[PDB]
Symmetry: C4
Subunit: 138 residues, 4 copies
């Protein structure tokens, strides 16, 4: 049903990484990733880029050196998504202010145009064939 | 009357979360929430995503393990309300830029068109008279 | 020349604060505000919203309790200004992608339609007068 | 092939500053800029504006007093270039909301009307000829 198609995506990326993070990280870092609810919080703060590296990820990379992939992949993937709601909402907003009625007004203006142009077409037909007759007598 | 309609909702979402803040946290966290004014500055801090979690929320979450609702929800509400204040401005910005005129220049263009098409409904109607006379005059 | 109107303004606000700030704070907080360049770098850092409070503002507010006006006002005002520079660039950006090019077709493609109607006006007019030199040459 | 054009401009700016940065800073700040890999992470971190100053910049400018240029300039160039990516997406978004479609809805529609007019045009000519001959046959 539109934007909330992406929202649902965001919740899902969250859930995937929150689980991924609790599996990978819970033992060695329990306060940040000890439970799945814990990591939902951490990823929230990470997603808002708050001390994500200096206070959460650079620490985690010391234990697990390859774990920048978790953190950089999430910033990348979650930002791109958050971006879209912002877009998907900008757009659908423009649409209500404008596009919705713009297409409508001009669909309709062209009905008028077309109908006028239609009338002319007949008159020229009636006239066309008056002249048709008149010439046949001549 | 447009945007300061929301930009006020902002001002009261602030005022509420700032009283709720002081009542709840004033006592363990005096510096941050000790007084209503002290909590505004703190949420102004929080709203800008400045150190909100490592600096404030997680320490508050240490004392009141539920507090994250207060913090996560403030961010959702204030970020959004700010989003709208923004769209509202991006949109009314497009209007004056472009939709103002494209809408109007068009009404104009298609008056002109309509007039011309009327013009010749006329001749054609008149020519249908002349030919209508040739027929009776025979 | 458009947005670069505010771009100039932003720069003015920036510099007025870097001076308003070196005058107020440089005595007591030299590393942050000691020289003008010093304050500028720190106000750039405050503009990027980075450690603006837990880092710089809070410690300055505890010498100079009133000093929140400075950091809150600077963020508010400079965010508003960057907000607009941003919109102005979207507007301007999409004036190019589409709107300029669209109005170029809407116009030229109605030159076409107008011209077409003008030709049919003449034809009906030329016709309208043979049909009435019949009315006279009989 | 579009903004991907611009995304490539960004990846080039990283590369340049990550190398300018590892050459410049790896002796004194090995953790941050020790190796290219290190240096990029650090720059991605600066780009998200995460402690770029209190955490990374100000410490280095302690040691190399002029390095405010490396950091300030990277945040501009780096950030200004990510803006154009954000616009570019914002645009190609509308292209496919609307512009794509309304743009061509109208091409179609003036075919609809050009074609009509063309028709009327035919008939009026046709009528003229009929008047032409009516005219001659009777002179
Ligand atoms: C998409 C945005 C959703 C982000 C909201 C995250 C909510 C996380 C949550 O409900 O956690 C339950 C309790 O964990 P808590 O935050 O108390 O753990 C801190 C370590 N002691
Ligand atoms: C939205 C602008 C795009 C820039 C990159 C986004 C990262 C910063 C995210 C701000 C977090 C605010 C909470 C998101 C609301 C989601 C529901
Ligand atoms: C829209 C959001 C703008 C909110 C600005 C907050 C105003 C703060 C205020 O009026 O009260 C006095 C300042 O308290 P202060 O920040 O000095 O407390 C630090 C702890 N000693
Ligand atoms: C709007 C964006 C422009 C802002 C960039 C400002 C850069 C100013 C600058 O380089 O000043 C240098 C003077 O001192 P410094 O930056 O070294 O301060 C630390 C003292 N230990
Ligand atoms: C453009 C945006 C993408 C930039 C992401 C940069 C990631 C760079 C990378 O993964 O390289 C190797 C990681 O080194 P690491 O961050 O582990 O170094 C810590 C030194 N103690
Ligand atoms: Cl538009
Ligand atoms: Cl027409
Ligand atoms: Na931060
Ligand atoms: Na931030």
């Amino acid at each position: 049903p539109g934007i909330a198609w992406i929202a649902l995506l965001l919740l899902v990326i969250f859930y995937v990484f929150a689980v991924m993070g609790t599996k990978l990280f819970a033992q060695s870092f329990p306060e940040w990733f000890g439970t799945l609810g814990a990591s939902m919080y951490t990823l929230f703060q990470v997603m808002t880029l708050e001390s994500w590296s200096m206070g959460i990820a650079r620490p985690v990379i010391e234990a697990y050196p390859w774990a920048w992939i978790y953190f950089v992949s999430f910033i990348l993937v979650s930002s791109f998504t958050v971006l879209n709601l912002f877009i998907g909402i900008i757009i659908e907003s423009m649409q209500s202010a404008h596009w919705e009625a713009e297409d409508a007004k001009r669909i309709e203006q062209e009905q008028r145009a077309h109908d006028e142009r239609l009338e002319m077409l007949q008159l020229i037909r009636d006239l066309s064939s008056k002249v048709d007759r008149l010439e046949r007598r001549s």
